[PDB]
Amino acid sequence: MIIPVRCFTCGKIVGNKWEAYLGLLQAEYTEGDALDALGLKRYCCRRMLLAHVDLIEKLLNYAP
Amino acid sequence: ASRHGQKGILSRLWPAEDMPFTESGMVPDILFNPHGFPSRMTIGMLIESMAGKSAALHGLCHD
Amino acid sequence: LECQGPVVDRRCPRCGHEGMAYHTRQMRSADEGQTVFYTCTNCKFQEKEDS
Ligand SMILES: [Zn+2]
Ligand SMILES: [Zn+2]
């Protein structure tokens, strides 16, 4: 739905790395460097942001 | 369950300091037995394990 | 107008022959296992293993 605040495996704060991740991907970085240049080093954290489907823009369309 | 049809009931929530941390600093997330493999022969789970590790380490998405 | 299947080098319980012909059959549910049927080459003693 929305990005988890902490990474699941080891609790790095990854909730503050989502808008700056989309910003790196719109600026023509690759996902192997938009996860490198945010400071996500272990693959348990890079799992959390690469594989995340932000399912709340589709969910807010049904707005009153 | 995983996606290779190998159900596992949740038995015990083991605290994080007790988990075997790796050489990279990572604890695991789910511990799975080696003893679900020789009778059920899910080679697809081992290749999915290697492939998910090699995809999260590179940003790729693997076919 | 045979050789009773492929052999595996397993010792028989009765006659002690070095090999037993085997046949598999998935007799349980789809949840677990594969039941292996053995048959000795010489004295034809059939036992089953459940893995
Ligand atoms: Zn982590
Ligand atoms: Zn025999």
Mind explaining what this structure looks like?
The structure is cut from a larger assembly and holds chains A (64 residues), B (63 residues) and C (51 residues). Chain A is an all-alpha fold and 64 residues long. Chain A has helices at 19-26, 43-50. Chain A has one domain. Helices cover 25% and strands 0% of the residues of chain A. Chain A starts with 18 loop residues before the first helix and ends in a 14-residue tail after the last helix. Chain B is mostly helical. Chain B has one helix and no strands. In chain B, 2% of the residues are buried. Chain C has strands at residues 7-8, 20-25, 35-40, 48-49. In chain C, a hairpin with a 7-residue loop joins strand 3 (35-40) and strand 4 (48-49). Chain C is globular and about 35 Å long. Chain C starts with 6 loop residues before the first strand and ends with a strand. Chain A binds chain B through residues 8-10, 30-35, 42-44, 46-47, 50-51, and chain B through 24-29, 52-53, 55-60. The PDB classes it as transcription. Keywords: RNA polymerase I, human, rRNA transcription, DNA-dependent RNA polymerase, pre-initiation, Open Complex, transcription. The entry is titled "Cryo-EM structure of human RNA Polymerase I Open Complex". Chain A: DNA-directed RNA polymerases I, II, and III subunit RPABC5. The organism of A is Homo sapiens.
